[model samples]
Target: AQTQTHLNFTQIKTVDELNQALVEAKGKPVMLDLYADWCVACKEFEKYTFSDPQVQKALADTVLLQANVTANDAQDVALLKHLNVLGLPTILFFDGQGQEHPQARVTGFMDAETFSAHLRDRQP
Candidate 1:
């Protein structure tokens, strides 16, 4: 059976929509996950990192968004270029003011504990 995470994630395909969400998500943390279907590490992030109970609880109040670029269409390519993201599984964190924290970016697979710690680091 496929397991489901409790993170109420909002999937946005374009940078515009993401920008809009960031603007609208005031007074709350925002987490944007860059993903692709064939990305092995991304699958690991789904099955492991994101599915962790601690991680889920840690991110329960955050605005979780996922950009699935499996199709590699125009919007996806442009968004990747805009973020200067070179690969999959790039997790971007935003503060309560919807400000992006480039320093806290997660570019590779991280275990549950590590991922949870990362989220905590965003707390203030």
Candidate 2:
């Protein structure tokens, strides 16, 4: 039997690639996740927050991207530093024009409903 599938997150390793995608996704919402494996909170967010159907449906209209820094490769550090992110789980949201919403940077773990609420009020 078939089960719910995971979101198609375009893996980005560098700042420029991510920026290029944001520009490409103009006219639609863009979600870029800065994630790491050793971070418990990041894992929780993936298991609980992203596993929720409502959250999945809510994000259907957006361009989903992820940078898994578990490997901690050269580009990952560069990407994180470029974004000024010093943490393991940061979600960056951008509007239709590829402009990032400053306050929409989610730095901690959130339940699906809460995250969906943020998506409803923040994303456009």
Candidate 3:
């Protein structure tokens, strides 16, 4: 059997971790997937959007990060507040310097094609 190699998208586990990841990801674009366990849209995005080959390829050179804001994780709470995430599923694109790019975010459930188009059209 051939073993599949999985990409290790960084997960924000703590404030320190988030800081470190941001520093490490400097000079590279990043996709921040903010999600909660109870978010139906989050599941849809994970299952449909990120799973798309086109989206995967576009993000191949970008740092992918996930944060679970619903778990009420200490760092997550702070980060969510900083990012002004009032919704369950929000996707934010950031530049290498950890600055929010495009100043626009996608909310709710989106399919693979729409998500791919968003990624392609958006600036970050």
Candidate 4:
């Protein structure tokens, strides 16, 4: 039998919600995924990299969050502005202190092996 090992992501719509989630994360590292329904690479991450065993294991200790900007509404725009995100499928990493690590940002799709290694190197 195959074991189900999908990563759970908390859906946040606004900056306030994200701040609240950050507070709730305590000292855990955080991974924020900016996605949209029209984003092809976002779906690729879901179907490929995120489904990989190594990627899941690497993120086991991190708080996973996702923002869907498919609508591109006022709230979505505001949140995107708040995060300074320029495009979709952007993955941001935050340390235990709630500080975002720009050097660890992933602006494009990465394979399981590379993504897992990136996660390991950026672990809090």
Candidate 5:
């Protein structure tokens, strides 16, 4: 079995960090992974999706952030509402301008292959 190197997905825990990240990622596409510690699917995503080599390489140039909604972290929650996120492990894709695209979500649990395909299919 190949040991997978996890992507450098920033885990956003505060309003400042979230805002700073969003601002810094301006003019660059972003993939926000909304997750919760208690959610099994979220854990699976870390173990499978985010840890997949292909997925890691594919997202190398993209801004990837993880927000824990349940933490009640004001910024994260606000972002959830802003993005209208309704599910755990939601993968939201944003354009360079930080605008939400029509096909902005990958809801539910996914394996490495499916997740890789998802990222590949969506392009800014």
Candidate 6:
């Protein structure tokens, strides 16, 4: 009677928090989603990409982290700077060693199929 599927994300705010999460991941792959309230693509990911059952299943083994920079406050700005991300709707993938693969970064919206392919292509 259990048929629920959803990508559960751990919300983080600062570089320190993100680093702590990376360490806590303990060798599991990590996915960091940079989101914003005003970002249309971010909303698109939530509604279209993240809602997909396949996408959820694919990410089940990964540690999901989300940073909401909606307020664009100092902390948010600093976090974005630390990550060297210049835009919203950004997704970063880290290997088991917590090293981010620049080639695996996504900066735009992608559908479930496309996201699934992207995930496979970037799999470590």
**How well does each candidate superpose onto the true structure, as a TM-score?**
0.90, 0.91, 0.84, 0.93, 0.82, 0.94
Screening candidate 4 with a backbone cut-off below 3 angstroms (N, C-alpha, C), the clashing residue pairs are: none
TM-score of 6: 0.94
Angstrom error at residue 109, model 2: 0.5
Clashes of 4: 0
lDDT per prediction? 0.86, 0.87, 0.77, 0.89, 0.78, 0.92
Expressed as tens digits, the lDDT of each residue in 21-84 for candidate 6 is 9999988999999998899999999978998989998898999999999999999999999899
Deviation in Å, model 4, residue 108 alpha carbon? 0.3
Identify the candidate with maximal lDDT.
6
Given candidate 1, what's the lDDT at residue 77? Answer: 97
TM-score of 2: 0.91
- List runs of model 2 lying over 4 Å from the truth: none
The best-first sequence of candidates by TM-score reads: 6, 4, 2, 1, 3, 5
Q: In model 6, which runs have C-alpha deviations exceeding 4 angstroms?
A: 1-5
Error of 1 at 46 (Å): 0.4
Candidate 5 lDDT by residue in tens digits, 2-117? 65467777888765776688789999998878778888998999887788778788888999887777766667677777677776878878788877675748788988888778
- Give candidate 3 misplaced runs (Cα > 4 Å): 1-7
Off by over 4 Å in 1: 1-5, 122-124
Clashing pairs in 1: none
